[PDB]
Amino acid sequence: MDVFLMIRRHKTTIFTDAKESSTVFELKRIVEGILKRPPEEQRLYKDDQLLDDGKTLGECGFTSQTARPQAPATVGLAFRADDTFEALRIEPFSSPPELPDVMK
Amino acid sequence: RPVLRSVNSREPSQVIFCNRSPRVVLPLWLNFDGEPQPYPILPPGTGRRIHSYRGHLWLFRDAGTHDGLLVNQTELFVPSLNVDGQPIFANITLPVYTLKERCLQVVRSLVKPENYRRLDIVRSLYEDLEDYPSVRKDIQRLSQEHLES
Amino acid sequence: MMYVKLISSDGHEFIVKREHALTSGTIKAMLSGTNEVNFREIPSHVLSKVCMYFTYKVRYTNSSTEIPEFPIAPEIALELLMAANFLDC
Q: What membrane topology was assigned to this protein in its record (chain B) (predicted)?
């Protein structure tokens, strides 16, 4: 069962996809391929909860019903800074303008 | 003599229209002169058994907007004869519209045509807004495609 | 499994599978002008959505299962229409 995701850190968002049976670790390998930071330098989060490398995305709560192509679920990403880890920070997107009058 | 028309086989075919779409669906029966005739609406997620005929021609549109829908992954549905006591399924689904066409649909649903030109968009898009989905138009295209194959 | 980077006017980076981004012929043209495209007039609430459309399009095109609706909030429809028009997707 395919799950569609946004891995988000700061003002970076990765659209990628995997299986309910894929592991958290496998996602870090994707991150590493794109952002050039090894797994041991990355933490992944669901909400504010740290995910273990060995759990499946399914076990973490990502079902294909919820992590959909047109509405992907979010995985948080934080990188190691020196010896400590940065705090998870995901910046929001911009706000649309107010709705046009003729659309109300 | 229209290109696309129901053939008057007079041979019954039992069909199920299966609305696998979130749209309110309008079935259209192209009569023996190729004119579209509207049948009772199908609410999203519903199915209905219909007594149709071999060689009849059907197409399916959004009942509110006349946006085009697929039936068994194509544009037209033709009943064949039933075998083994089984109805023919007409599985009606959304196409994957272009993002453009999808945006056009949402805007048409929110804005009165008279008000299209108050929208702060490039002029070509006003034009596109106004070029509504048309059964007539689709029958023209489908007629030509049919002749080509 | 090359990814490309699409940058919004407000400086969000969206990193997507190249094959998914090539759903837009505009983006294709822009990419063979790096693996990076800067959209100075498309903001993040719009471009995020365009990215989800690419995923949706690739996932459901020639599917033969039931297709969900692509959701569009009324408050983003106009900007998204403009972007869709420019990107030809």
A: Peripheral membrane protein
Rounded Cα distance, A64 and A2, in Å: 6
The CATH code of the domain that includes B46 is 2.60.40.780
Find the largest Cα–Cα distance for chain A.
55
DSSP label at residue C45: H
Would an 8 Å CB–CB cutoff place C86 in contact with chain B? no
Cβ burial A12-38 (10 Å sphere, 16+ → b, else e): bbbbbbbebebbbeebbebbeebbeee
Q: How many domains does chain A have?
A: 1
| Resolution of this entry, Å | 2.1
CA distance A79 to A9: 9
CB contact under 8 A, A15 and C56: no
Nearest CA of chain C to the CA of B141: how many Å? 21
Superfamily of domain C2-89 in CATH is: Potassium Channel Kv1.1; Chain A (3.30.710.10)
Q: Is there a contact between A102 and B112 if contact means CB atoms under 8 Å apart?
A: yes
Q: Do A102 and B119 touch (CB under 8 A)?
A: yes
Whether A99 is covered by a domain: the verdict is no
Measured CB to CB, residues of chain A less than 8 Å from chain C are: 2, 4, 11-17, 33-34, 68-72, 91, 93-100, 103
CA angle A15, A52, C48 (to 5 degrees): 15
Examine residue B130 and state whether it is found in any structural domain, yes or no.
no
Residues spanned by the domain of B74? 12-95
- Which structural domain, as residue segments, surrounds residue A19? 2-87
Method: X-ray
